[PDB]
Amino acid sequence: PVSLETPIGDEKDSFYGDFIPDEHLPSPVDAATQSLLSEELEKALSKLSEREAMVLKLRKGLIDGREHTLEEVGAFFGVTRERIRQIENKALRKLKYHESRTRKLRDFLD
Amino acid sequence: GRLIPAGTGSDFVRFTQVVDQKTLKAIEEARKEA
Amino acid sequence: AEPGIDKLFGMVDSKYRLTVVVAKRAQQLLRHGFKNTVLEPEERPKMQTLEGLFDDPNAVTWAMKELLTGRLVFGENLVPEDRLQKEMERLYPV
Amino acid sequence: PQEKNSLKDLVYQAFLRLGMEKTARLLDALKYYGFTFSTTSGITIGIDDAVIPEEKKQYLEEADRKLLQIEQAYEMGFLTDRERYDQILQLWTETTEKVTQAVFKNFEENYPFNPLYVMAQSGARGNPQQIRQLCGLRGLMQKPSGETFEVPVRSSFREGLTVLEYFISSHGARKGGADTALRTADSGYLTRKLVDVTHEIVVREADCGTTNYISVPLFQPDEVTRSLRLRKRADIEAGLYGRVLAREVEVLGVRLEEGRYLSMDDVHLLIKAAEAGEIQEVPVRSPLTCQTRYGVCQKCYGYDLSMARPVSIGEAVGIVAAQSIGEPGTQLT
Amino acid sequence: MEIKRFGRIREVIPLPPLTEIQVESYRRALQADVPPEKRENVGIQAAFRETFPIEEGLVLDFLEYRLGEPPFPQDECREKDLTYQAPLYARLQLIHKDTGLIKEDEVFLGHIPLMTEDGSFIINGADRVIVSQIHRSPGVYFTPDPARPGRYIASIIPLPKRGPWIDLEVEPNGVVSMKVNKRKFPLVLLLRVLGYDQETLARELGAYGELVQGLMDESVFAMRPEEALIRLFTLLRPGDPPKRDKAVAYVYGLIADPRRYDLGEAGRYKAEEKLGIRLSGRTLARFEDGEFKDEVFLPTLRYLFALTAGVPGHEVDDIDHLGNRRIRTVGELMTDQFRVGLARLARGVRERMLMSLTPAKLVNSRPLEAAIREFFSRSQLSQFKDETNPLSSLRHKRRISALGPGGLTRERAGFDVRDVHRTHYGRICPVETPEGANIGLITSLAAYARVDELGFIRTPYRRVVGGVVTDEVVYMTATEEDRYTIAQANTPLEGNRIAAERVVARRKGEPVIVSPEEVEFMDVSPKQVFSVNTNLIPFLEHDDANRALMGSNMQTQAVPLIRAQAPVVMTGLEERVVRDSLAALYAEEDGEVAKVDGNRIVVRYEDGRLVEYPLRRFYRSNQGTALDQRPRVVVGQRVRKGDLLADGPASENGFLALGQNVLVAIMPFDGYNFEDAIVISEELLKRDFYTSIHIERYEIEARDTKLGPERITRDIPHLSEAALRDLDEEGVVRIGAEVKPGDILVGRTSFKGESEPTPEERLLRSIFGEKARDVKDTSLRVPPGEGGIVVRTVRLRRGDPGVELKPGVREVVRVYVAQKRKLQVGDKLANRHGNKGVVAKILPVEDMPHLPDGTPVDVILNPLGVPSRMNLGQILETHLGLAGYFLGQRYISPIFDGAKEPEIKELLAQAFEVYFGKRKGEGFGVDKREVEVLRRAEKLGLVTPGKTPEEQLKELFLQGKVVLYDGRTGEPIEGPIVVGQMFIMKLYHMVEDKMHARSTGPYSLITQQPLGGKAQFGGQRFGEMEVWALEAYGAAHTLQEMLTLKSDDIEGRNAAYEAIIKGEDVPEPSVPESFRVLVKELQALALDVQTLDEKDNPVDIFEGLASK
Amino acid sequence: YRAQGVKLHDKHIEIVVRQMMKYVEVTDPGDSRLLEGQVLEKWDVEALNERLIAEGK
Amino acid sequence: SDPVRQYLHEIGQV
Amino acid sequence: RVDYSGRSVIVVGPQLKLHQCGLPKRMALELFKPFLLKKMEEKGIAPNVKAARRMLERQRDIKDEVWDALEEVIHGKVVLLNRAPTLHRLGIQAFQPVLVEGQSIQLHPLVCEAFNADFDGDQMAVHVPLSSFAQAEARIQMLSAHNLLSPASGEPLAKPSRDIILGLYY
DNA sequence: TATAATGGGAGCACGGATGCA
DNA sequence: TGCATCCGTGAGTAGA
Ligand SMILES: NC(=O)c1ccc[n+]([C@@H]2O[C@H](COP(=O)([O-])OP(=O)(O)OC[C@H]3O[C@@H](n4cnc5c(N)ncnc54)[C@H](O)[C@@H]3OP(=O)(O)OC[C@H]3O[C@@H](n4ccc(N)nc4=O)[C@H](O)[C@@H]3O)[C@@H](O)[C@H]2O)c1
Ligand SMILES: [Mg+2]
Ligand SMILES: [Mg+2]
Ligand SMILES: [Zn+2]
């Protein structure tokens, strides 16, 4: 490796490290984007029923961070795993419909 | 990175409040309520 | 020069106090969507677009013009902060 | 005729009387008409606009005459080497002055609308020295060691320098450049020092209620120490203007109350009073005497000099001081 | 058109080859054109002879070296980012004296960089110039002791890094003290080591009263030279065991060993000449027959004593005399680094000798290659070459730096070395120096000056014998020049004889009036006092030095123009510059032009051989100015030897063309020319004056990574055919394509990092049923404000012929983008007199001030720029330009010898006839407007009352003033205006390059603060002084924003951005990151920093993250 | 400054000069805890001194 | 002052 | 170093009012960019913020709607101009930007003396005050037309000079 | 892991605060 | 008490 303190200018005013960007911390734009994405997903999940939106939220990990299995979400709502699978299917279907009309979430696909 | 104690950051001028007469009387009658 | 700046300075013991008043008032206008303004319809700050005259979006232009009218009361310890904010939220929700 | 000083005074008076919105308007009008007329006025520079006064030749010839009277007096032993060199320097200094006066008198009498003359007189551009070098002689040049050459530069930039003259000039040019270069750093360092020592000083309160004050002398002992003379106007202004009176001052029938901020007019009045022998010194509130902790007070500081009105509490007067002192720093020779 | 040249002075000799200071120096260092046995002990030959033989295999010796041919030509070297260099081999014989063994082999020492034809190097693809270095000549000097007036210091100075400075002083106590390596000690002791006895010193130094008594010490003469040697060694080296052979070795290395201690050949000569002695070698003493024998010390101490005693013929030394300061050219510098690398290679040799051995086994050339590579790449004196125009390169090569390794540091240089010394005359230009912090530290070699074999700068003079000026020209150093009365070059001559009974001359720089009987020498020319640049300023005698400096320097900043012209008024150096700068192309022998193409010219010479000269076409210089040669001859044309085949960049028919000749009016215009700003006519754009070509080079790498290969591809995730439109099949933009900011130059995809999607990503991917790709778009795009036409694309791939990249790199693409830049607002213009300014207004032709015949002016310069600046050369240039504008001719008006007013007036009169008479014959009389203006001029004293209108207009014209109508109105400008032709250059500072803004962007790693500079998309520095300005206004919130929201408060800038795009008010700022950094760095220093609340409780600004 | 034609108000210089005088040196501790030759701010020693005058110390 | 010299000395004491 | 800042070459502004400065469009688009995004969303110009930014990324995707929008964004707002070295407080001053074509910042004549600015190739830096508070400070306290007198001597700092004096004298 | 080897090598200038004559 | 020593300091922004 090379030293971050390697001089740049001819006078000693300047370090090489100083021309090196930080790629780790999210830019203000990045942060803003994930914010708008959480808010837009939340806007789109309110056009569902509380149960089907909760099913998608528990299935994709938006709730506790973990993505639950169909048997677990079906055990949570007290229904059959096939039933919760179908509630999931119609939820996702309604989301695709509202998306098709509103155009709102498309831009976030990069 | 604090707000300096001079100009608009002075303890002399910085706590100054603005309120319009409508909101002012609206509060004034509410504190005259109790 | 900001219109009426001399009178504006006339109003306060310290110019920095003028600045604070104007800034806070503009925060209020911004928060309440201007619905709380002390300006009459014909006193409203205007901006000329392509289409036509629209309300001036600049809240500080507004706040200053308001301050010029006399309709605003400024000072220290006029009213508890939470109470002011709540009475304003009641009077002009948003 | 309106020149730099008259216009500056107009702006100041208009500030005092009409306020800053109006003065900004006046400034823009002055700007506009000034530019407009300067376009059509026919101001230009040809080589013939640098006018060599005939007198120069005479003044030169005469110099060469006295230049002999010194030389001879060296050979005969009446003059040392030092006294001779010093007499030559004095001669050429007085000659340089002579041809300057010649240049400007010639302009004023025969060519009052000459571009160089107008530019210099108005304050638009140029000072007498630069005009002299253009028209009269460049004058004396300095050696690298700093001591002056015996031979002046007789040429003007109009006439053009000899390569030897030119080379002689370059020493001074370079010493001047290196001096500027090395001075800006010392000025910078000084400024940062002053800022660091003064930064916490802010106007924190309207009055510290001190009874103490400083007395601004309106007179100074002369270098002859023969008598006391009135200080220069600007010195008095710089010590007085915008200050709060520490005590009531009664002069010329006018009563200046205690607590009064001295206007420029109040100051002029006091000066005229001192001229009439009614007062030799003015009691005044000062940061020197202020009892405010961590800064000064409004009364002790006086005017915010930028607004021509009492300073607003909260103003950082320390930084303003350090900057006000530091800024001219590169101009000190 | 016709060229009239003024001036009486005839130059007896032409200007010396202008780059010879580089060319000859390096030619001499390498000695490549000499057969190995015929080489002298100068140069890298000196290096080898000094390093070898290597003793204690047993002995390794050096026979000869050789330089091979360059493996690649120059253009190829620039293409592939290689170094233009030749292989270096050395024949070495390893000898064993015990074994009687001899093994002889030619070893490869690596490569050495070659200078090109023009005096520059190509180092890793970029052109570099090695700048010469002025310094104190080695030798023996005597300066006054600043502390004790009446006492002196003798100083013995060798070459840089050639051993210790030694000081001989006479101490207050009376004993003479020698100072070496910051250790004082009685000189007597060393004198005893040298074999001196008390009687010998009493003999020699006795002549000078009481001093030698201070030199006299009993105990010292008591002990033998051996004992005094060991005593001295114990004085110099405390703690080192006082063994005698150890002491001998050390003191030998210090004062004797030629491989350790070296005076220059310059230092040798100087010591000899000052002390009036003869030096056997280049060292202070010798080792002969087992003992030390003196050379320098006694003569030195002698001179010191004699000086102290006030003995005649002994004087102090001016250290700023150009006899005591010498130039170290490229050859000397490179040879010095060669000497270093070779000494290291030799340490490696000796080290390897102690462990079946040949030379190739004993020798590692890595340290040598490293010393050379380090000198050329990373030295301060090795400068990225200034090729903006050809003159800039020429000037670069002729630079003299007081800076660099083995020289002064900035701020450690007082007025002394920055000064113009009297001895600079004809040697170093008194004018051309940088303004600002480097003033006087960087200078330029004078036009006629030469650096001699000893490194001293010499200027030519003409021998004058008995008032007769011969054509014999002697080149003198400053010390030699100090002997003579030298007449000025403009001294009147009838034929070869001095025609004046009083002549202006110089004796030791002092101006003096003498007789032709007293004149020993005479100046060759005034040209010799100034640099090459300063010599291109007409009427320079009428320009104040400070502005002349600016014009002089700004000429090297001129951009080559597509329509470029030579000045209407030239000094006469314009052709020699183009010739020596190797810009243009010339015919080698007499001949006939066979073929002419845009790309190539083919010429058949007398001999009959058919020679093909290829032309460099739209090549990008270091500075991005376009360098290209254009054919100046047509098929079948008969050419002589030296005739011009092709014009280079910024050349018009082989004359230096740095700019344009425009018609100027000097007059204020509506504030648009306020404070040095300039108003120009739109017509200038219409005819493409001031239009310049610039080429930018963009580069991108695809390298092997751990997550996959990066690759150049047209297939870029989530991009429209709109976006990929101009991309070729491989992903690289096609030649000819116009690119604008945001456009793709080269497509590249990189494998995505190690990541798991956040729940939002998962849900989103579910909603759209689009699988997230393995790669992301890393494509090189045109940066903000850049772009143009793509004129070239180079591609280099791994696995391809003759191609090898840095380890890990699969492929490198370089795209070239050319732009034609019209003159625009903010671009910088300047004349040769140091009048400079930016274009603030471009007026339509109908608004320009115009002559009565309808001709509009091009440029309006403000007269207010003249009087305080005192540069009138531009005024005279303008008058001469008016005259030459109507006569259709150009002039050569050399410096200090050139067109005076009366001749300018003659030309102006002739011009007036053309200007006016044409109109009078066309059936037009004077205009009512002209009558009004004439009335005004009459009142101004410009014209004589009573004369006709035509006569008065002529009277104005002879003053270079014309009636000028206002384009806006048609009313005349109330007074008459100076209008004429001026030569104005467009400089390298273009607002296109400097305009930059940033909203948010990259942040620094540690500080979390915005990066710097346009290229990094950086933020402006708001530093201590600006903060002070905000404090002084008492704007607390603006300040707090600068300190937090707008820089390193992470939460704050994030929140601020989000809130601004939502239309919310900006949030209250929080703790700036650099403060947390300060706290943690202070914790690292074992100091506990604690932010507290008003109750003196700890406040956590780290929000729990750092506390267990 | 006057020599160079720079008009500058006295009070700016007076503020800095005031800072130059900010400190004092103890020539006797009296009843305080302070040491002879100790340097400190004039304000602090004035406060202390009036506290000790209030105590009768 | 110079650690190598010092260590050399100490070494030389045995 | 700070965000929301730029720099360019200054050029004389004779037409300008004392409180105004010429600011290039290309610069202003970047300096006020987030505001321009919000405004582009309020108007029809983009579905949302991200589309607006993407549309600003490529220079050929930019249309006059965004220019008029940017005009609406800066209305009433000021920017700070700064020239180094900043010797006294007047080395930073506040101006209302007038958007101009071309890449040079246009500076008012009467402020040159205070900035020690001239047209020989000087450059200035621009800063956007973000908050209503920063804008209040900027417009009331720092605005060019509000500081006419030297805090140092009390004499007019912004005053006729050069060509202005020349013409009035003439 | 065993012949014996035993001490390095390069390298301006001013003020202020303190230590030493 | 005064001479000598060690230590710290020497403008900004750009840019590279
Ligand atoms: N310097 C190189 O190594 C180099 C490499 C490659 C090519 N070139 C060419 O030479 C020109 C650059 O010359 P230099 O930079 O070496 O020297 P110079 O001062 O004469 O440069 C001319 C302009 O560059 C600007 N500059 C330089 N240093 C600057 C600093 N520290 N701050 C701001 N600007 C700086 C500047 O614009 C110069 O123009 P002027 O000298 O006429 O001054 C214009 C105004 O700028 C301000 N200013 C200047 C200088 C300093 N120190 N501070 C300032 O504030 C003032 O307001 C001034 O009125 C290139 O063109 C290239 O061809 C060199
Ligand atoms: Mg400038
Ligand atoms: Mg200027
Ligand atoms: Zn007070």
Structure tokens at C5: 């700046």
Q: Is the CB of E437 under 7 A from strand J?
A: yes
Structure tokens at C42: 């014909």
Q: Cβ(E627)–Cβ(E385) under 8 Å? A: no
Tell me, rounded to whole angstroms, the distance of Cα D64 from its chain centroid: 35
> CA E127 to CA E108: how far, in whole Å?
26
CA distances from E892 to D163, E390, E565, E571, E877 (A): 18, 21, 15, 5, 11
What letters, b where the CB count within 10 A reaches 16 and e where it falls short, cover D76-89? Answer: eeebeeeebbebbb
Half-sphere exposure at residue B26, Cβ-oriented, CA atoms within 13 angstroms: 16
The nearest alpha carbon in chain H to C30 belongs to: H132
Instruction: Identify the residue whose C-alpha is closest to ligand 1 atom 10.
Output: E557
Q: Which domains does chain E have, with CATH numbers?
A: 1-6+658-690+823-987 (2.40.270.10), 16-137+318-459+525-583 (no CATH), 138-317 (3.90.1110.10), 460-524 (2.30.150.10), 584-648 (2.40.50.100), 691-822 (2.40.50.150)
- Residue E74 has phi, psi (to 5 degrees) of -65, -50
Q: Which of D113, D165, D115, D156 is nearest to D134 (CA)?
A: D156
Strand partners, E672: none
> CA E657 to CA E584: how far, in whole Å?
12
Distance D182 CA to J10 C1' (A): 10
- AA identity, residue E336: D
> CA E235 to CA E251: how far, in whole Å?
12
Residue E685, chain H, CB below 8 Å: the answer is no
Structure tokens at E749: 């995809």
What letters, b where the CB count within 10 A reaches 16 and e where it falls short, cover F26-39? Answer: eeeeeeeeeeeeee
Q: Cβ(H7)–Cβ(H52) under 8 Å? A: no
CA dihedral E490, E491, E497, E498 (to 10 degrees): 170
CA distances from E386 to D240, E390, E556, E594, E697 (A): 57, 9, 8, 35, 17
Q: Cβ(D81)–Cβ(D68) under 8 Å? A: no
Q: Which of H110, H108, H117 is nearest to H161 (CA)?
A: H110
β-sheet with E85-96: strand ranges across:
E59-67, E85-96, E101-113
A/B Cβ contact: 3+ pairs below 8 Å: no
Q: Which nucleotide has the least CA–C1' distance to E412? A: I12
Q: For every residue of E870-916, which 3-state class applies, written as one string?
A: CECHHHHHHHHHHHHHHHCEEEECCCCCCCCHHHHHHHHHHHHHHHH
Half-sphere exposure at residue E744, Cβ-oriented, CA atoms within 13 angstroms: 27
As a whole number of Å, the end-to-end CA separation of chain D is 32
Q: Cβ(E427)–Cβ(E400) under 8 Å? A: no
List % helix, strand, coil for chain H (3-state, nearest 5): 40, 20, 40
CA dihedral D64, D65, D68, D70 (to 10 degrees): -100
CA distances from C57 to C60, E235, E1063, H74 (A): 9, 84, 11, 9
H3 annotated as belonging to a binding site for a ligand: no
Task: Supply the range of the domain harboring residue D143.
Answer: 47-179
Structure tokens at E1019: 């933020």
H163 interaction partners in chain E (CB closer than 8 Å): 668, 671, 673-674, 862, 864
Residue H141, chain B, CB below 8 Å: the answer is yes
Burial (CB < 10 A; 0-12, 13-18, 19+), residue A5, is exposed
* CB–CB contact E1058 A18 (8 Å): no
Structure tokens at E491: 């001294």
Three-class DSSP category at E474: strand
Best of E383, E754, E764, E1074 to mutate (most A CBs within 10 Å, chain A): E764
Neighbours of E639 (CB within 10 A): 19
> Which residues, numbered 46 to 105 in chain H, qualify as contacts with chain B under a Cβ-Cβ cut-off of 8 Å?
none
Q: Cβ(E996)–Cβ(H8) under 8 Å? A: yes
Structure tokens at E225: 């030279």
- AA identity, residue E524: V
F11 interaction partners in chain H (CB closer than 8 Å): none
> CA E474 to CA D94: how far, in whole Å?
43
Distance D141 CA to I12 C1' (A): 28
CA distances from E532 to E489, E987, E993 (A): 18, 19, 29
- Which residues lie with the beta carbon below 6 Å from any ligand 1 atom? E 386, 388, 434, 436, 553, 557, 623, 836, 988-989; H 84, 120-122
Tell me, rounded to whole angstroms, the distance of Cα H79 from its chain centroid: 5
As a whole number of Å, the end-to-end CA separation of chain A is 35
> CA E840 to CA E673: how far, in whole Å?
7
Q: Which of E403, E410, E420, E442 is nearest to E556 (CA)?
A: E442
Q: How would you classify the pairing of strands C53-55 and E828-830?
A: unpaired
Q: Is the CB of E759 under 7 A from strand J?
A: no
> CA D144 to CA E513: how far, in whole Å?
22
Residue B28 C-alpha, separation from nearest chain H C-alpha, in angstroms: 28
Q: Return the ∠ at Cα E325 (arms to E322 and E331), rounded to 5°.
A: 120
Q: Cβ(E252)–Cβ(E287) under 8 Å? A: yes
Q: Which domains does chain C have, with CATH numbers?
A: 1-94 (3.90.940.10)
* DSSP state string for E787-845: -EEEEEEEEEETTSTT---STTEEEEEEEEEEEEEPP-TT-EEE-TTS-EEEEEEEE-G
Neighbours of E403 (CB within 10 A): 18
Q: Which of E1065, C17, C10 is nearest to B18 (CA)?
A: C17
Q: How would you classify the pairing of strands E2-5 and E889-892?
A: parallel
Q: Cβ(D285)–Cβ(D243) under 8 Å? A: yes
Residue E1054 makes CB contacts below 8 A (sequence gap 6+) with: A26, A28, A31, A32
Q: Which of C35, C55, C36 is nearest to C46 (CA)?
A: C55
A33 interaction partners in chain H (CB closer than 8 Å): 50
What letters, b where the CB count within 10 A reaches 16 and e where it falls short, cover E873-911? Answer: bbbbbbbbbbbbbbbeebbbbbbbbbbebebbbebbeeb
* CB–CB contact E670 H14 (8 Å): yes
Residue B8, chain H, CB below 8 Å: the answer is yes
Q: Cβ(E418)–Cβ(E438) under 8 Å? A: no
- AA identity, residue E706: K
Q: Cβ(E837)–Cβ(E676) under 8 Å? A: yes
- Residue E21 has phi, psi (to 5 degrees) of -55, -30
Q: How would you classify the pairing of strands E655-656 and E692-703?
A: unpaired
How many CB pairs (< 8 A) connect A and H?
15
Among E557, E678, E987, E1021, the mutation site with the greatest number of ligand 1 atoms within 8 A of its Cβ is E557
Site of tokens 């274009």: E839
Q: Cβ(E752)–Cβ(E777) under 8 Å? A: no
* CB–CB contact D306 H166 (8 Å): no
Structure tokens at E666: 């000097």
- Residue E344 has phi, psi (to 5 degrees) of -70, -45
Structure tokens at E799: 């696995």
> CA E878 to CA E911: how far, in whole Å?
14
Q: Return the ∠ at Cα H146 (arms to H142 and H151), rounded to 5°.
A: 80
Q: How would you classify the pairing of strands E655-656 and E711-712?
A: unpaired
Site of tokens 């010195």: D235
Q: Which of C22, H151, C21, C13 is nearest to D316 (CA)?
A: H151
Instruction: Identify the residue whose C-alpha is closest to ligand 1 atom 40.
Output: H121
Q: Return the ∠ at Cα A70 (arms to A64 and A76), rounded to 5°.
A: 60
β-sheet with E630-631: strand ranges across:
E585-586, E644-647, E630-631
As a whole number of Å, the end-to-end CA separation of chain B is 43
Q: Cβ(E677)–Cβ(E838) under 8 Å? A: yes
The nearest alpha carbon in chain C to E1035 belongs to: C16
Q: Return the ∠ at Cα H122 (arms to H120 and H125), rounded to 5°.
A: 165
Q: How would you classify the pairing of strands E660-666 and E780-781?
A: unpaired
The nearest alpha carbon in chain D to B5 belongs to: D314
C-alpha torsion sign, points D207, D212, D215, D216: negative
Q: Cβ(E1069)–Cβ(E1039) under 8 Å? A: no
Instruction: Please give the sequence-ordered ranges of beta strands (E in DSSP) within E911-972, or none if there are none.
Output: 961-962
Strand partners, H22: H98, H106
Three-class DSSP category at E700: strand
Q: Which of E444, E101, D313 is nearest to C19 (CA)?
A: D313
Q: Which of H97, H118, H110, H108 is nearest to H149 (CA)?
A: H110
Q: Return the ∠ at Cα H65 (arms to H60 and H70), rounded to 5°.
A: 100
> CA E1059 to CA C70: how far, in whole Å?
32
Structure tokens at E202: 């009493």
| Residues in the 5 Å CB sphere of ion ligand 2 | H 118, 120, 122
> CA A93 to CA A96: how far, in whole Å?
5
- Residue B20 has phi, psi (to 5 degrees) of -80, 155
Residue E232 makes CB contacts below 8 A (sequence gap 6+) with: E185, E189, E190, E193, E247, E251
- Answer whether the bond into residue E844 is a cis peptide, omega within 30°: no
Q: Cβ(C91)–Cβ(B26) under 8 Å? A: yes
- AA identity, residue E1006: I
Rg (CA), chain F: 18
Q: Cβ(E715)–Cβ(E723) under 8 Å? A: no
Q: Where are the alpha helices (DSSP H) in chain A?
A: 28-45, 50-60, 70-76, 81-102
DSSP state of B5: S
Residues in chain B: 34
Residue A107 C-alpha, separation from nearest chain H C-alpha, in angstroms: 7
Q: Return the ∠ at Cα E924 (arms to E920 and E929), rounded to 5°.
A: 110
Between the CA of H119 and the centroid of ligand 3 the distance, in Å, is: 8
Half-sphere exposure at residue F56, Cβ-oriented, CA atoms within 13 angstroms: 0
Q: Cβ(E301)–Cβ(E140) under 8 Å? A: no
- AA identity, residue E823: L
Among E555, E829, E989, the mutation site with the greatest number of ligand 1 atoms within 8 A of its Cβ is E989
Q: Cβ(D285)–Cβ(D213) under 8 Å? A: yes
Structure tokens at E532: 């090459």
Q: Which nucleotide has the least CA–C1' distance to E146? A: I13
Chains with 3+ CB–CB pairs under 8 A to E are A, B, C, D, G, H
Q: Where are the alpha helices (DSSP H) in E354-389?
A: 359-362, 366-378
Site of tokens 């229904």: A79
β-sheet with E788-797: strand ranges across:
E692-703, E809-821, E788-797, E738-739
Three-class DSSP category at E775: strand
Best of C15, C16, C64 to mutate (most D CBs within 10 Å, chain D): C15
Three-class DSSP category at D194: helix
Q: Cβ(E225)–Cβ(E207) under 8 Å? A: no
Q: Cβ(E306)–Cβ(E300) under 8 Å? A: no
Chains with 3+ CB–CB pairs under 8 A to D are B, C, E, F, H
**Ligand nearest the Cα atom of residue E433:** 1
Residues in chain C: 94
**Ligand nearest the Cα atom of residue E550:** 1
Q: Which nucleotide has the least CA–C1' distance to A14? A: J16
Q: Cβ(E527)–Cβ(E16) under 8 Å? A: no
The nearest alpha carbon in chain H to D115 belongs to: H166
- Residue C78 has phi, psi (to 5 degrees) of -80, -35
Say which of D4, D12, D38 has its CB closest to residue H167.
Answer: D38
Q: Cβ(E301)–Cβ(E186) under 8 Å? A: no
List CB-based contacts (under 7 A) with strand I: E 181, 237, 239-241, 250, 253-254, 260, 347, 411-412, 414, 416; G 2, 4-5, 8-9, 11-13
CATH number at residue D86: 1.10.132.30
> CA C15 to CA C22: how far, in whole Å?
11
Instruction: Identify the residue whose C-alpha is closest to ligand 1 atom 39.
Output: H121
Strand partners, E790: E817
Site of tokens 């007498």: D128
Q: Which of E716, E728, E982, E1009 is nearest to E875 (CA)?
A: E982
Say which of E668, E740, E1000 has its CB closest to residue H59.
Answer: E740
Reported structure resolution in angstroms: 3.0
Q: Cβ(E201)–Cβ(E218) under 8 Å? A: no
> CA D241 to CA F25: how far, in whole Å?
35
The H or E element that residue E183 is part of is strand E183-186
The H or E element that residue E186 is part of is strand E183-186
Between the CA of E819 and the centroid of ligand 4 the distance, in Å, is: 65
